[PDB]
Structure 1
């Protein structure tokens, strides 16, 4: 046969709100993105995943949708969206949109209607329950602070919201609701979108009766929220009624679920979703409370990647990324963002990202080596999630405001949301006004204009890597083997296909290291290296590595 285009594609994630402002209000928009398509095409991007672009009050920057058929006012008009679509097609590029249907905004007409009385036809489009013992219906906590149940004086009942209080969860147990969601998907699919990514797909099915979580379940409530008994039945129904009739690739953001459950969502035979977005790797060093970090090593990094790759089996398929809108900057998180190591570790991480088995997603700015932001106060964070931590940990006295600041500065989602650094003009050329979130001061040295014409820049390294992955089948769809899962200094692995085998070797330490190839394996050619003064000699049986050196080789 032949593998789907998405298996060998290189994606780029665009967080519109922080990509390019074209009208000075401080917020990125569609015209800004459209304006930059040549830039992304020049980088080598085959497809783009854009975060929510629908009408929204923005309590959660797009993830709280008030109208699924209207574009977000801040991003432009439907006309602008259409133009973006057309310009993408002109360049033979594809678009993947985010689909948020676990919950809607509390400003969506379905909710306004639903909440008005106990007897309207939209009551069951959401979850309404009586409280118990003078308290909420049960002990369900919300990811964004306090209880997941909010009382509404109009009826005396509580509505469910796993996330924000203004993000009431939709009721998938109601057939009419499901049908409205399907009609909604076709609306966008009919416009030609090539892919759909489903925000927290594993939480659609709620547990019948809403019994309290046990003390143990309470310790990782996210997991219990992915245990609805009708989850896969709904996902299968959605595929049968919708995707079965289209040519779009589907991807699921499997948030909170144990890795062993992943295959149920992506095994092509099950006819649910095509690709998986998991959190195991990107949160491999994150505490349960989500704002503390736990020390880990390369050994933990690779072993996690090893498990994730393994559950894709023969019929499944994974996405791979080191960054996104919900996590700290890749170079800061996995590399070394100190002035003297930022570029070297950034290039090394790029080598990892583009040689992994699965479909790579490059988050905007990582091609430049962008870092975390130097937050000084809790007020420097815009994120609703941080407010949630304050409510749950500072007001309850479990931690001081300074403790929260110290720790969340390294885990916050806002680290990834500061304006993309185009050049060194005001606000790194992101806007002519005041950015919605402060630009990182390091924009004077880290910016696209400065790296674009520099063949030694992190940008060029990514471009060269993308070019190379595109020309080497084994690097996309080939098998994967970790040479030594327990090694905490150097990450080395092979990718193979149709007799050809490649070797990737990446030094994660800021010191010289050595690597001996597996018995009987020899360097045949060097495809590329970063931070290396000399390529190995043909036939080499070992490698000498500089601090943070990376390389892709064809072996024999």
Structure 2
């Protein structure tokens, strides 16, 4: 029964404003820098842009600690700039999604400033304030960003709750006044015409009644305890009923800490909650659930089995986003491909083909379209992210893990690998800034930059452009049902996308050797749609493919 919508068949691009384009030489990207480059994104073929938080913030967590929801970040520009970004996008038929961060505010936000003044302030129970127990915190909750999730306040002697930085106190959603104020805030932005909202850590809004301690076992996977709040779907559905269902918008849910088997309740269209699932299963398939900075080896069979299970779980009534990287994860060509110079461009084109042939709304993160890589961080001070500093404090400063072993993992897992500034050209600081970038630019910018690619028809950029054109032209690549040809194959990832008689096959060789691959059953090729790194001709009725290393392709199959 499912209906097409613009957001199901959109190709989104994600801009992290702080690292996209600086137009005033302070080293920090800003809104004018986005506006300046809308034609570049239109040329790529992007339907909609999701921007990370753009609100007044002290930047403990680069926009995710909001000091005033109705004001533009000072480093990003003014309200007039933000309105111009909407206006200039609208002229180009591009839709804007903004990031909604309402699990918590900055500890500088006026509500918290008031809350913390005494048990008595009308804003006290806007946040969570509990007595200590035995001269320590109210319970054994840890924070995602290091140490205890409870911060002592010497004035009152109680502690306040912060799942994330102590500068990110959690809002009390159990207070209907808090929920009402947040809805008013959402209407202020929605009335400006924004087309989409992405809800940061949407699954933590409901806290566990009476805050009991976590078990020893729970402490090793605590995020999954924080998403078990008994009213979470009541609150998300109330927000849908009172606000979301009043605008023509697309809503995405970042369901951090939600196991896949509890995800469909946020996205089933019958439930009137949210529209698009942002899950962590694939992008962190190789991350430890306890030591969340640690990675382990992974295989293509592990990867594809997660793709399939994520696809199955959305089923008839939910809907997924699909992304291999974003501002919270290492770059896709490094993590999932081979970023050495022999292979980088082929592997980036193969992961683009994978991304843009999923039954999901694809999100392209800034710079993935050039094949940008992870950055060669050497020492702990080369990073800037609050989260990596919290993991260092919890695991290296306690002597639990050697500094060098920790660094070998966070070089591969740090959020900062995707935050080095966008590589526009081969000029100084890759054309990102006339001043000093806030985070050092990868020296590979001389090889990997947009200017070198945009007019080269063989570039990663133009392969993405072609794939997006192909996706927009073939309905089965958006809405077709997905079948993995062999979930246990660790060499060649092959799967079909089917709408009625229209059946297409995607084949990607993840090996760096030639692989012969014979199709199953009676499948045979009707025609080639696109290939990268092919050295062979594929004809009507062919049943076998010779795949060069990192070869990728889309084919239409015979009925």
TM-score by length of structure 1 reads 0.99
| Secondary structure of the structure 2 residue equivalent to 1:7 | coil
Q: Does 2:475 correspond to 1:478?
A: no
Match of 1:533 in 2: 535
Cα drift, residue 217 of structure 1? 1.0
* Alpha-carbon distance between aligned partners in 2 of 1:203 and 1:488, rounded to the nearest angstrom: 36
Residues in 2 aligned to 1:518 and 1:312: alpha-carbon distance in whole angstroms: 26
SS in structure 2 opposite 1:409? helix
| Residue 124 (structure 2) aligns with | 123
Q: CA RMSD in A?
A: 0.7
| 1:175-186 alignment, distance < 5 Å | 175-186=176-187
Alignment map for 1:76-87 (pairs within 5 Å):
76-87=77-88
CA contact 2:276–2:320 (8 Å) conserved in 1 = yes
Going from structure 1 to structure 2, the CA distance change for 1:517 and 1:79 (only over 3 Å counts) comes to: same
Q: Post-superposition shift, 1:406? A: 1.6
Q: Shift of the alpha carbon at 1:292?
A: 1.2
Unaligned segments of structure 2, at least 5 residues: none
Match of 1:18 in 2: 19
* 1:59 alignment counterpart: 60
SS in 1 for 2:302: helix
Match of 1:521 in 2: 523
The residue number in structure 2 matching 1:356 is 358
**CA-CA distance at 1:518 after TM superposition:** 2.0
State the partner residue of 2:200.
199
Q: What is the distance in 2 between the residues matched to 1:308 and 1:533?
A: 34
The equivalent residue for 2:382 is: 380
Distance 1:48 1:518 in 2: 39
Question: Counterpart of 2:165?
Answer: 164
Cα displacement (A) at 1:14? 0.2
The SS at the match of 2:7 is: helix
How many residues are paired up? 556
Residue aligning to 1:466: 468
What SS is found at the alignment partner of 2:338? coil
**Which residue of structure 1 aligns with residue 230 of structure 2?**
229
Q: Distance in 1 between matches of 2:537 and 2:507?
A: 12
Q: C-alpha separation between the residues in 2 aligned to 1:126 and 1:37?
A: 39
- 1:154 CA displacement: 1.3
Secondary structure class of the residue paired with 1:62: coil
User: What do the CA deviations read for 1:489-518 (whole angstroms, capped 9, x no partner)?
Assistant: 000000011310000000011111121112
Q: How does 1:338-487 map to 2 (within 5 A)?
A: 338-487=340-489
- Following superposition of structure 1 onto structure 2, how do residues 123-142 of structure 1 map, counting pairs within 5 Å? 123-142=124-143
1:41 matched to 2:42? yes
The answer to whether the 8 Å contact 2:536/2:546 transfers is no
User: What is aligned with 1:489?
Assistant: 491
Q: For the Cα contact (< 8 Å) 1:418–1:440, is it kept in 2? A: yes
- Describe the SS at the equivalent of 1:21: coil
Note the C-alpha offset of 1:27.
Answer: 0.3
SS of the residue corresponding to residue 112 of structure 1 reads helix
Mind listing any 5+ residue stretches in structure 1 that lack a counterpart?
none
| Partners of 2:333 and 2:347 within 8 A in 1 | yes
Once residues 444 and 247 of structure 2 are traced to their aligned partners in structure 1, the CA distance between those partners, rounded to angstroms, is 44
Q: Deviations over 1:390-421 (max 9, x none)?
A: 11011111012222222111100000000000
The answer (yes or no) to whether the contact 1:125–1:177 under 8 Å persists in 2 is yes
Is 1:4 matched with 2:5?
yes
Tell me the distance in 2 between the aligned counterparts of 1:64 and 1:534. Answer: 53
- For residues 312-323 of structure 1, the aligned pairs below 5 Å read 312-323=314-325
Once the two structures are superposed, residues 79-137 of structure 1 have per-residue CA deviations (whole angstroms, 9 ceiling, x without a partner) of: 00000000000000000000000011000000000000111110000000001011100
Residue of structure 1 equivalent to 2:191 = 190
2:452, 2:247 → 1: CA distance?
42
